[PDB]
Design a protein around this ligand. Structure first.
Ligand code: HEM
Length: 153
C-alpha cells in the first residue's frame, strides 16, 4: 500500500509526463523493444520495425504509446482503487495478447528510465522509489487476475 506522500510523488511526476504523452510513449515502447526484443514479437502491429529510426518514424507506434500511457495514467490517478480499470486490461493481456507478467516488469523498467531521463528534478530517488512501488502494485494486482484465469505460470 502506498502512502499519501508516495502517491503525491508519483502523480507529481506523472503530471509532467502528461505534457508530452506521445513523446514519452515512443521513448518507452522503443526502450522496451530494444532492451527486450521478445516483447516486440508480441505485436503483429509493430514487428516489421527493425531499427530504432524506423520505430521513431512510425506514427502508429506513437499512437499506441498514447493509448498505453493514457490507460496507465488513469490507473495511477486511482491511487490503488483501480479494480475497474484492471479487469479489462488483465483479461486482454492474459487471454488475447498473451503477455507474461515478466513483460510488465520490463515495461515498468522502461517507464522508470524514461521518467528519470525527462524529469530529473521531479524524479529523484524518493520519487523513483514511489513510482517503483506504484508499478509493483499494478503488477501485483494484474498478476492476481492472471492467476484467476490460469495464466500466471
Ligand atoms: C503499463 C503496461 C501496459 C498498459 C497500461 C497497456 C495498455 C494497453 C491498452 C490500453 C491496449 C489497448 C486495449 C487492450 O487491448 O486492452 C493495449 C494493447 C496491446 N498491448 Fe498493452 N499495455 C501494457 C503493457 C504491454 C506489454 C508489456 C505488452 C507486450 C510485451 C503489451 C502488448 C499489447 C498488445 C500486443 C496489444 C494489442 C496491440 C494491437 O495490435 O492493437 N502491452 N495495451
Amino acid at each position: 500500500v502506498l502512502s499519501e506522500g508516495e502517491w503525491q510523488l508519483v502523480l507529481h511526476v506523472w503530471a509532467k509526463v502528461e505534457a508530452d504523452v506521445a513523446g514519452h510513449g515512443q521513448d518507452i515502447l522503443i526502450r522496451l523493444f530494444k532492451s527486450h526484443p521478445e516483447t516486440l514479437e508480441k505485436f503483429d502491429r509493430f514487428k516489421h520495425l527493425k531499427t530504432e529510426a524506423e520505430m521513431k518514424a512510425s506514427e502508429d507506434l506513437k499512437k499506441h504509446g498514447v493509448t498505453v500511457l493514457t490507460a496507465l495514467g488513469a490507473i495511477l490517478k486511482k491511487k490503488g482503487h483501480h479494480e475497474a480499470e484492471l479487469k479489462p486490461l488483465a483479461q486482454s493481456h492474459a487471454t488475447k495478447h498473451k503477455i507474461p507478467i515478466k513483460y510488465l516488469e520490463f515495461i515498468s523498467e522502461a517507464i522508470i528510465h524514461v521518467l528519470h531521463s525527462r524529469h530529473p528534478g521531479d524524479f529523484g530517488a524518493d520519487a523513483q522509489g514511489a513510482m517503483n512501488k506504484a508499478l509493483e502494485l499494478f503488477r501485483k494486482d494484474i498478476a492476481a487476475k492472471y492467476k484467476e484465469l490460469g495464466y500466471q505460470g
